[PDB]
Amino acid sequence: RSYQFWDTQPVPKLGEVVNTHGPVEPDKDNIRQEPYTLPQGFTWDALDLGDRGVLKELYTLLNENYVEDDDNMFRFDYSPEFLLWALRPPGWLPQWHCGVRVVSSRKLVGFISAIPANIHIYDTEKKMVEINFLCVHKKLRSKRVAPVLIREITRRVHLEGIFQAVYTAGVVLPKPVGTCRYWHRSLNPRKLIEVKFSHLSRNMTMQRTMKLYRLPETPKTAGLRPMETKDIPVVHQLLTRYLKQFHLTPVMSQEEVEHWFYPQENIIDTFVVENANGEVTDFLSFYTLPSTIMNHPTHKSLKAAYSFYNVHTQTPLLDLMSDALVLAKMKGFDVFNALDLMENKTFLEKLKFGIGDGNLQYYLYNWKCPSMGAEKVGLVLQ
Ligand SMILES: CCCCCCCCCCCCCC(=O)SCCNC(=O)CCNC(=O)[C@H](O)C(C)(C)COP(=O)(O)OP(=O)(O)OC[C@H]1O[C@@H](n2cnc3c(N)ncnc32)[C@H](O)[C@@H]1OP(=O)(O)O
Ligand SMILES: Cc1nn(C)c(C)c1N(C)S(=O)(=O)c1c(Cl)cc(CCCN2CCN3CCC[C@@H]3C2)cc1Cl
Ligand SMILES: [Mg+2]
């Protein structure tokens, strides 16, 4: 595919060999003050997610027009409260919640977001942004609106003095820094087979499959408990030290650790291991993101838990993730999803995860560096 838009952007070309490390173009010392022109009848609007009505409008846009599987059976159902968690971390800016509205009706038909993040990439730490929730309403598709959204968020980020970004997508664009693969652990195999997320091996029965994926009723690790306020510093310490081994990671402040890990029901779960000495030595975490199930008579929503950050120093990772599955099961999740990044390959096959179809490509904007294997990627975006 010849990339009409992406060929114009400061990113390496697909199949460019990259032996260097650094920006593609210099920081811009003058920035376009005027928003990019949209097609006639549409206008920019910064979305105040503190206005419940506006948040609801965004919820609806994404609920109806965001990412679907290739067979149009599932669509992500990001909740309003989840969207607040994902889009208002420390340093969030209202101008980086970038909406497109119809002029006449004010209907929300487009969105893109940036949130700030300090990013470690090989031997460099840079203040960057993370781009997510790029969404164009189905009736506006293939009219070149996404490039305008990308240029406009780029402009708004440039105005704040930031010249690099990190982002992920299911599609191949110039040029991935790394490629990960989704893996899936059945928790409720009957429902997953009923809704055609999984399929029964012609070998096996339903009772056999349920027996195969059965988990204990309680976790095995000594002194596992939910994260509490007093754990914020040590969770930060554990995460900071653990992430140094990977080549692409966030560098979180203690306030960011609080934001991303402190438990919020139906959004983010974090459990810490406090040993017999009273020291916190490990933690596991996973976020809540259901998918709407289209066209099934009895089942309307697929409850999925997503592996977030799991830090081990004294508990074996295999055991940590076993307890993660048990906890997810207890809370009523149908499936536990995880990528093959960080050290996840050490446990996926052993804990009966099955490999999915979807790839997640990782990208940097305006940063040229060698690509890395999935096991060196240490960043998880919602
Ligand atoms: C320094 C600061 C920098 C900040 C910015 C950093 C970069 C941020 C980049 C964004 C990070 C997003 C992170 C996420 O949120 S990934 C999730 C993306 N969202 C969805 O998949 C939801 C469902 N799909 C849609 O809403 C639309 O189909 C979208 C909006 C995806 C495309 O709209 P539409 O279908 O109406 O297409 P068009 O005619 O307007 O535009 C076609 C052009 O756009 C290129 N395209 C297609 N898909 C993607 C994609 N996922 N990332 C980047 N580019 C993409 C495509 O190759 C083509 O360019 P080229 O092939 O001609 O070159
Ligand atoms: C049950 C279900 N519901 N939906 C909606 C889907 C697709 C399924 N599957 C069938 S799946 O196997 O679970 C699966 C698959 Cl095929 C592909 C992907 C690629 C995710 C794309 N990115 C773009 C970037 N964004 C920022 C970080 C992630 C986010 C989304 C994810 C999954 Cl989760
Ligand atoms: Mg379009």
From Swiss-Prot:
Enzyme class: transferase
Catalyzed reactions: N-terminal glycyl-[protein] + tetradecanoyl-CoA = N-tetradecanoylglycyl-[protein] + CoA + H(+); N-terminal glycyl-L-lysyl-[protein] + tetradecanoyl-CoA = N-terminal glycyl-(N(6)-tetradecanoyl)-L-lysyl-[protein] + CoA + H(+)
Keywords from the named record: Acyltransferase, Cytoplasm, Membrane, Phosphoprotein, Transferase
Membrane association type: Peripheral membrane protein
Disulfide bonds: none
One GO CC term on file: cytosol
Residues binding tetradecanoyl-CoA: 4-6, 133-136, 142, 144-146
Effect of mutating residue 66 to P: Abolished glycine- and lysine-myristoyltransferase activities
Resulting phenotype, residue 78 to A: Reduced glycine N-myristoyltransferase activity
A GO BP entry: N-terminal peptidyl-glycine N-myristoylation
Assigned EC number: 2.3.1.97, 2.3.1.-
Tissue specificity annotation: Heart, gut, kidney, liver and placenta.
Phenotype when changing residue 67 to L: Reduced glycine N-myristoyltransferase activity
Location within or outside the cell: Cytoplasm; Cytoplasm, Cytosol; Membrane
Gene Ontology terms for molecular function: glycylpeptide N-tetradecanoyltransferase activity; myristoyltransferase activity; peptidyl-lysine N6-myristoyltransferase activity
Domain of life: Eukaryota
Keyword Cytoplasm found: yes
Similarity-based family: Belongs to the NMT family.
Function in brief: Adds a myristoyl group to the N-terminal glycine residue of certain cellular and viral proteins. Also able to mediate N-terminal lysine myristoylation of proteins: catalyzes myristoylation of ARF6 on both 'Gly-2' and 'Lys-3'. Lysine myristoylation is required to maintain ARF6 on membranes during the GTPase cycle.
The protein's name in its UniProt record: Glycylpeptide N-tetradecanoyltransferase 1
Native source organism of the sequence: Homo sapiens (Human)
